[PDB]
Amino acid sequence: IPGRFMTIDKGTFGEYTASTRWPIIIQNAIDDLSKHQETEKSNGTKFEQGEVIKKELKEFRQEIIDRVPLRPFTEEEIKIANVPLSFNEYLKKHPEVNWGAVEWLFSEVYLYRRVNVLFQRQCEWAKFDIFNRLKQSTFESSFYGVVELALRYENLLPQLREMKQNPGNEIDDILKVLFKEFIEISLWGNDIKSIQGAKARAASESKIVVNDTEKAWEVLTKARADEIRVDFVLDNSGFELYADLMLAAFLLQSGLATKCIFHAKDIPYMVSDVMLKDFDILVHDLRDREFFPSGEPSTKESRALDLFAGEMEKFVSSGKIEFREDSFWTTELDYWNLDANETKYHGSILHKDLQKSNLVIFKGDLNYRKLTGDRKWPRTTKWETAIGPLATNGITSLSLRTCKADVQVALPEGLDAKLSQEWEKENPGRGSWWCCSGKWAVICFCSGI
Ligand SMILES: [Cl-]
Ligand SMILES: [Mn+2]
């Protein structure tokens, strides 16, 4: 089995990322922390505690630049911040790994844990999300797109109820189109039967170099003719989360699903990844006319946003949408650990629970990297091979991934060469980095048997 991508691997996107991107992220956190300091008094416990975090962040950023060895977490840090013990277990088995030379996957997870520790050490900042300012401003600028979808949903809803109420092969054909639509909207994160609509799908689907959406459509259609549970291992908040809720809402109203369970992160993570509280913030944002300026409540734009917001609450009340968090999602462990033999860090718990799912949707690049172990697979490698135990341990999984990392699998022969030639124009000498640009995407399915 190939090793994992490293921060030392010359000519890899991971090399650039570790050395360049991460120092910038820590800097942004310092600046955003400062930005937040402006809105509060310049003394007292909270301010001074901010000064301690700010300083330690500066030092931590410098650690990464200086390429120092990754230190274990102290027993005290573990207690105060409830750090999973998996980290120190990994470091023992990986002596003297430094930022300049360490497994990409680990050090990236490890980075956000170190940052979290800093905040949880200061009581007044334990619950503070240093990336919330960024999440919000990004979601606010998606105002146009949020409304468009809200309008699309309101006008589809009467029709969806009718399609579920009177279902036949005639209606299935229509639903398939909408299924691919909402899948792909969810995929790309941030009329339908006409030309422009058809021109749009074809353009999107062209950049989906592998597309197993039909198979997921089969598991659900089949299950509907047997209690249909769909799972979302989430990625980013804002519009991507909004898109995911739209997919869920579509599935629930059409009858393709009866309960959608969302799995979120339990700490500020990957800057913009979803936490439990990000769902409530989203709904509040929809209703906030200062955040999303759609005018007076009577406007069509306002009504649509309020409708969907109300649809979210209703689904939660009735138990059709449920959000969850688990420390496992924020550990370094890949999803080969979603197996019965991982009894230390909830891996076995989630696996047992994910077996009950008719379809588990893994969102985003990180989730894709954890599925494939972030390993240097030949890019033609079979999908079932790269996911390890997940191919057989009884989990039905669908991966909606925008390609943003060196890892890539399940490509047909020759396609890696073609796409590399295409991207060669944008990134000369590094055509292979096409799967790190986010321009292309893949949809991979596995029954679990
Ligand atoms: Cl703020
Ligand atoms: Mn993310």
Which phi and psi angles does 356 have, rounded to 5°? -75, -15
- Report the amino acid identity of residue 304: A
Run of H or E residues at 361: strand 359-363
The rounded Å distance from CA 269 to ligand 2 centre is 8
**Ordered structural domains, the chain, with CATH:** 1-128 (1.20.930.60), 129-449 (no CATH)
Interrupted after residues, the chain (C–N over 2.5 Å): 190, 226
The rounded Å distance from CA 252 to ligand 2 centre is 25
Q: CB neighbours of 301 closer than 8 A, spacing ≥ 6?
A: 147, 150, 151, 294, 295
Q: CB neighbours of 132 closer than 8 A, spacing ≥ 6?
A: 268, 281
The rounded Å distance from CA 331 to ligand 1 centre is 28
Q: Is the distance from CB of 443 to CB of 213 less than 8 angstroms? A: yes
Q: Is the distance from CB of 115 to CB of 29 less than 8 angstroms? A: yes
Q: What is the DSSP letter of 230?
A: E
Strands 259-264 and 321-325 turn out to be: parallel
The rounded Å distance from CA 28 to ligand 2 centre is 16
Resolution in Å, one decimal place: 2.4
Q: What is the DSSP letter of 262?
A: E
The rounded Å distance from CA 368 to ligand 2 centre is 11
The rounded Å distance from CA 59 to ligand 1 centre is 23
Residues at the annotated binding site?
A: 21, 108, 235-236, 273, 365-369, 404
Q: Which method was it determined by?
A: X-ray
Please give the Cα distance from 186 to 200 (Å, whole number). Answer: 15
The rounded Å distance from CA 383 to ligand 2 centre is 22
The rounded Å distance from CA 35 to ligand 1 centre is 6
Q: Which ligand is nearest to the CA of 133?
A: 1
Strands 441-446 and 397-402 turn out to be: antiparallel
The rounded Å distance from CA 23 to ligand 1 centre is 21
What is the rounded (10 degree) CA torsion for 340, 341, 346, 348? Answer: 0
Please give the Cα distance from 210 to 281 (Å, whole number). Answer: 34
Q: Is the distance from CB of 54 to CB of 34 less than 8 angstroms? A: yes
Ligand 2 is an ion; its neighbours by CB within 5 Å are: 235-236, 270, 273
Please give the Cα distance from 441 to 336 (Å, whole number). Answer: 22
Please give the Cα distance from 170 to 138 (Å, whole number). Answer: 40
Q: What is the DSSP letter of 206?
A: H
Q: What is the DSSP letter of 352?
A: H
Ligand 1 is an ion; its neighbours by CB within 5 Å are: 36, 133
Query: Positive or negative, the Cα torsion across 3, 7, 11, 16?
Result: positive
Please give the Cα distance from 135 to 234 (Å, whole number). Answer: 15
Q: Is the distance from CB of 331 to CB of 345 less than 8 angstroms? A: yes
